[PDB]
Amino acid sequence: SGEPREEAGALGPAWDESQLRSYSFPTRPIPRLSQSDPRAEELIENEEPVVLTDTNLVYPALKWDLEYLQENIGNGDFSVYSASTHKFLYYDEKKMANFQNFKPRSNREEMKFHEFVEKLQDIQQGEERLYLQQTLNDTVGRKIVMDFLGFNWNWINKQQGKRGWGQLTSNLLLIGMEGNVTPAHYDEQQNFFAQIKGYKRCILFPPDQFECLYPYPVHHPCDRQSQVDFDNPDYERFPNFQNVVGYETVVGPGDVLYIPMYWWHHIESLLNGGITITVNFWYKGAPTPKRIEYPLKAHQKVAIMRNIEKMLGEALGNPQEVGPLLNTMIKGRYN
Amino acid sequence: SGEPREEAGALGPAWDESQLRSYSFPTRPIPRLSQSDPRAEELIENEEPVVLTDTNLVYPALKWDLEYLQENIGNGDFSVYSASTHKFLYYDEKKMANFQNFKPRSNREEMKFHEFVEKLQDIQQGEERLYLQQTLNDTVGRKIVMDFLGFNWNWINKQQGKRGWGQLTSNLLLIGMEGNVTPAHYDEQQNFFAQIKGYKRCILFPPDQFECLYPYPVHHPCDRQSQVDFDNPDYERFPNFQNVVGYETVVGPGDVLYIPMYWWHHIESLLNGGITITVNFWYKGAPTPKRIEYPLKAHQKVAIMRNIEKMLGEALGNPQEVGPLLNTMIKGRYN
Ligand SMILES: O=C(O)CCC(=O)C(=O)O
Ligand SMILES: O=C(O)CCC(=O)C(=O)O
Ligand SMILES: [Fe+2]
Ligand SMILES: [Fe+2]
């Protein structure tokens, strides 16, 4: 992760190790570079993570905080997630019909910002934890729309153009509480993670560690999430979690982390670090080349495995038979 | 800026986008309200811009044009500014002694109105551009003095009384040519911008965008002006110009724009819109409250920075050392 950076103005260290959680695997630091540095462009083009420290991407939002937001964001509805533990168990509603025994571990709920601020206030007066996650569309107040327009769209748009990425699928505003943890998972789109308030420790695993992270079945509501409990790894069920090695960093106000598509990421708001605020940017990856180019990269093999699982689930007319058939194919033949 | 307003009498649109220049930043419309509307009074009291459409402030001047003026204004002298480009580079004479390498980019020149009208005529027979700017004192013809007396002094005086503003520092008559551009800058006084003939696009930036507009050093002849070339922004020298968001409008005959003190403003006479005529009104802001009131507003912090720069320039007995000392104070200590 690297030594805690010293804040300007002789203010103490931004954070200290005691705020970071302990895990069973090793890690090395993700590079912190300047957007002008040729090495940063090199990392992004090769689809490797990099923390850009001077993009000014969300510059107008650095002043944001709960008071400012509540007052100017408006009186619309915001999706607030809640959990009893620190780990926020998110899931896919549409895939619940496939796994009837799946009991929910986290509940969402629309509410007004001022309500979230209040509901958050008394919880600080507690084991419960909330996590607000909502898109930054025009639906919001005029002032917030001005700040939004003030983002460095010149930088990010140029970045989108040279990488060949597709459309910006969405912008997500995230406000969480200290200690909050979003378990490891991967997304299929390219992502620029812009930190605004507070610090978050981000642990990333490359796509080739698929075999050590044991993702749920594609048809399961937790598709794309790791089945391993990072706080208590079951080595009998997931032996290869003992070989996992990750890339880590702690991002703070002004930092932008590039999370390449298909890369795993574990995110946590530093303990006793106050609330955190982040805005993420999603872009569809560049279209896959017409003619295949070998040797296939790891993320491409992951795409293929996802496709096989999907096709099989439809061909058998039932996602619950996917596993049995796969075992039938493999046992005594390929294993 | 808003859709071009349709002129009365089924005359086409007042103007069309093709007449507006293209810039790298986003903008939203300044409210166009009636002076009777409570929202307008609310905007002015909170020191936010607003275009009042029915003040009748300069009603008698709406008939004005070059012929009428030349004939009745008199045979006195008028300060005419000239430039080779469209951007009029104005400067402070008194501060030239501090920056000897500063070469002038625009020249002033007293001349008689009929001469200005003539000099303007052949230029339309060209890259040169002129801009007449002179005060409306009794020095002028009897007829122009009658029109002047006919301004709605009842409205503006009442406005001056309720806002607590100081004396009317001056009245400026402005006559320019289509395409003319006055680069972004801020004034320290409150201003009512009364449009009389033609249309002008006005782009304003609030005081809190100080960090994105990079004003010249206080001792520089271009003090209060932005160092950024809006037509070709140097993002390496002024990275934060990528985060600038402005408030825009196009004022025409009869409109009065309130430009709050310390607010930045970029003004341009619509392309192929003919000459433009404007009269501005300057008032010293209301005296700063005896006991400070936190949290300080942005314009107050700008006042403080200007004061520090001024004091430092005198304390070191030389304005050229201000920068070196500021860097010495900051480097490795606050940055
Ligand atoms: O910040 C977080 O807690 C989660 C971020 C995340 O999963 C994402 O941006 O995809
Ligand atoms: O109309 C213009 O070109 C400039 C107006 C201006 O700068 C002012 O009224 O202070
Ligand atoms: Fe994610
Ligand atoms: Fe001005």
Swiss-Prot record, chains A, B:
Annotated stretches, region: Interaction with VHL: 1-113
JmjC domain ranges (all copies): 128-298
Protein EC: 1.14.11.30, 1.14.11.n4
Cofactor(s) needed: Fe(2+)
Residues binding 2-oxoglutarate: 131, 182, 191, 200, 280
Outcome following mutation: residue 330 to R: No effect on dimer formation and HIF1A Asn hydroxylation activity
Region span, Disordered: 1-39
Keywords carried by this UniProt record: Acetylation, Cytoplasm, Dioxygenase, Iron, Metal-binding, Nucleus, Oxidoreductase, Transcription, Transcription regulation
Cellular compartment(s): Nucleus; Cytoplasm; Cytoplasm, Perinuclear region
Any one GO MF annotation of this record: protein homodimerization activity
Site (described: Important for dimer formation): 326
Binding locations of substrate: 138, 167-169, 187-189, 224-225, 286, 307
Quaternary state and interactors: Homodimer; homodimerization is essential for catalytic activity. Interacts with VHL and HIF1A. Part of a complex with VHL, HIF1A and HDAC1 or HDAC2 or HDAC3. Interacts with NFKB1 and NFKBIA. Interacts with NOTCH1, NOTCH2 and NOTCH3 but not with NOTCH4. Interacts with APBA3; binding inhibits HIF1AN binding to HIF1A. Interacts with TNKS2. Interacts with PPP1R12A. Interacts with ASB4. Interacts with UBE3A. Interacts with ANKS3. Interacts with NECAB3; the interaction is indirect and seems to be mediated by APBA3.
Name this polypeptide is given: Hypoxia-inducible factor 1-alpha inhibitor
Annotated organism of origin: Homo sapiens (Human)
Taxonomic classification: Eukaryota, Metazoa, Chordata, Craniata, Vertebrata
Gene: HIF1AN
